[PDB]
């Protein structure tokens, strides 16, 4: 999909989502 994390493999639907996973301290801070 066009929104899948900079790392897992968690696939999401929009923006907002994609960016909750990179807001928390997830994993990509770069
Ligand atoms: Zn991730």
Not at 4 to 14: L, M, P, R, V
């Amino acid at each position: 999909r066009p929104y899948h994390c900079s790392y897992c493999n968690f696939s999401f639907k929009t923006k907002g989502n994609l960016t909750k996973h990179m807001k928390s301290k997830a994993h990509s801070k770069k």
